[PDB]
Amino acid sequence: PQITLWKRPLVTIKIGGQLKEALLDTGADDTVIEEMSLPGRWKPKMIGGIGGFMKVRQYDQIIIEIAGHKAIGTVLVGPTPVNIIGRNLLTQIGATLNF
Amino acid sequence: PQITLWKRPLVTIKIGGQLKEALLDTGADDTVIEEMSLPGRWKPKMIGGIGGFMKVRQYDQIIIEIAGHKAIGTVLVGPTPVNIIGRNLLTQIGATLNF
Ligand SMILES: CC(C)CN(C[C@@H](O)[C@H](Cc1ccccc1)NC(=O)O[C@H]1CCOC1)S(=O)(=O)c1ccc(N)cc1
Ligand SMILES: [Cl-]
Ligand SMILES: [Cl-]
Ligand SMILES: [Cl-]
Ligand code: NA
């Protein structure tokens, strides 16, 4: 698709068999999901945003579908205000910004 | 242009006579610039994201040139570590996210 930006660019994602809403965020280096169960071991990571830094759980090689496009990569889990799809997975679904 | 997302999507902007580097950010509702003076009236606002909230000054009807494209709208000013062009101005330059 071609998504305009008059409203938030919200899409459906599928992760761990569950459907969730997430924001396509070109200003986010990384993908961050609200609290949920994911398989495997996690690693620590600190990420920075508008309010400061915060700690998250880093899970690697997680299968995730984004607006129907399949991705497999790193998902951060933590107390984010909205689910965020960042550049690490936007590149995998072939997303570009155009003007 | 078409901008890929392997790297942060940074462009040059001109605001208040000043050249700055800014991130094209589909996850940001409004444009947020590092501390600088701007003309006219302002009112305070709180914006939220990763790490919590930041207090900003909201200036309306400000012109920015974004990669050569003029746009007018609200600009938030505060202690952001990165200048952010949000949806309110991305729409005006006809930016879309494509995949
Ligand atoms: C969290 C989203 C919903 C909203 N933010 C935009 C995001 O693109 C934000 C932009 C940013 C980059 C670097 C440092 C500081 C901020 N990146 C972000 O947090 O990257 C983290 C998440 C994972 O990867 C790393 S915002 O900055 O809070 C914000 C909120 C309101 C307005 N009006 C403007 C900006
Ligand atoms: Cl990844
Ligand atoms: Cl505006
Ligand atoms: Cl349009
Ligand atoms: Na004004």
Swiss-Prot record, chains A, B:
Function: Aspartyl protease that mediates proteolytic cleavages of Gag and Gag-Pol polyproteins during or shortly after the release of the virion from the plasma membrane. Cleavages take place as an ordered, step-wise cascade to yield mature proteins. This process is called maturation. Displays maximal activity during the budding process just prior to particle release from the cell. Also cleaves Nef and Vif, probably concomitantly with viral structural proteins on maturation of virus particles. Hydrolyzes host EIF4GI and PABP1 in order to shut off the capped cellular mRNA translation.
Domain annotation Peptidase A2: ranges: 20-89
Binding partners and assembly: Homodimer, whose active site consists of two apposed aspartic acid residues.
Coiled-coil residue windows: none
Protein name: Protease
Residues annotated as catalytic: D25 (for protease activity)
UniProt gene name: gag-pol
Top-rank taxon: Viruses
Positions of the UniProt region annotated as Dimerization of protease: 1-5, 49-55, 88-99
